[PDB]
UniProtKB/Swiss-Prot annotation:
The modification N-acetylthreonine is found at residue 2. Belongs to the small GTPase superfamily. Ras family. Its EC number is 3.6.5.2. This is GTPase KRas. The gene is KRAS. Acetylation at Lys-104 prevents interaction with guanine nucleotide exchange factors (GEFs). It comes from Homo sapiens (Human). SUPFAM superfamilies: P-loop containing nucleoside triphosphate hydrolases. Changing residue 58 to I: In NS3; affects activity and impairs responsiveness to GTPase activating proteins; exhibits only minor alterations in its in vitro biochemical behavior compared to wild-type protein.
Amino acid sequence: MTEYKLVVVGADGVGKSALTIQLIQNHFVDEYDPTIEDSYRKQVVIDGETCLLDILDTAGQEEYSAMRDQYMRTGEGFLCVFAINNTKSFEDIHHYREQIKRVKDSEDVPMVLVGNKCDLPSRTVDTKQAQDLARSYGIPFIETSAKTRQGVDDAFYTLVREIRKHKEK
Ligand SMILES: COC(=O)CCc1nc2c(N3CC(N(C)C)C3)nc3c(F)c(-c4cc(O)cc5ccccc45)c(CCC#N)cc3c2n1[C@H]1[C@H]2CN[C@@H]1C2
Ligand SMILES: Nc1nc2c(ncn2[C@@H]2O[C@H](COP(=O)(O)OP(=O)(O)O)[C@@H](O)[C@H]2O)c(=O)[nH]1
Ligand SMILES: [Mg+2]
């Protein structure tokens, strides 16, 4: 079995906790405490490999300490999540990407762009906008719904595949 340290980042309210819990428990949790940062394991077979996915669901205040940088640096791959109904969350993606590159001291960190809440009608960030951003970074884009589970396995499993490709460079 191989362990993978996955970190879920993005603005408050994009569905980081709901995506994490959907992966771990196969159910949609409404209004999970917005302040709580925590880690969960999922054991899963991906392309024949038994994987131990340790998933950090980030929360809390915007703060930069040396300890906070050290903790983020333990991530092997990052899900950069926005919500398709929240333009400001999409505009925050650049920041999260740059902070990941800063703490990892690398231009090439495993990352997937996730557009969550795809079950909602009130879409303000179009598929093309997200695809173009992801193309500019050289990373995959996956649309997800933590409500319906659409795309959830794809998002996490694609991230694992991106880590495996990085390990081979
Ligand atoms: C809508 O408002 C919010 O979402 C407020 C909450 C929020 N905004 C931001 C933020 N924003 C809002 C913008 N402001 C300028 C207004 C930038 N950057 C953050 C950032 F760069 C780091 C950060 C610090 C660090 O040392 C190293 C890192 C390495 C990789 C990735 C991130 C970090 C961290 C800590 C680690 C993580 N993730 C938090 C940031 C943040 N937060 C909090 C909530 C929502 N996202 C996190 C949980
Ligand atoms: N319709 C819908 N609601 C979602 C989805 N993901 C999260 N939510 C809701 O959006 C709010 C914020 O989700 P949460 O998981 O707390 O976001 P976090 O702050 O990024 O951890 C909650 O009310 C969730 O129930 C989704 O894919 N679809
Ligand atoms: Mg949360």
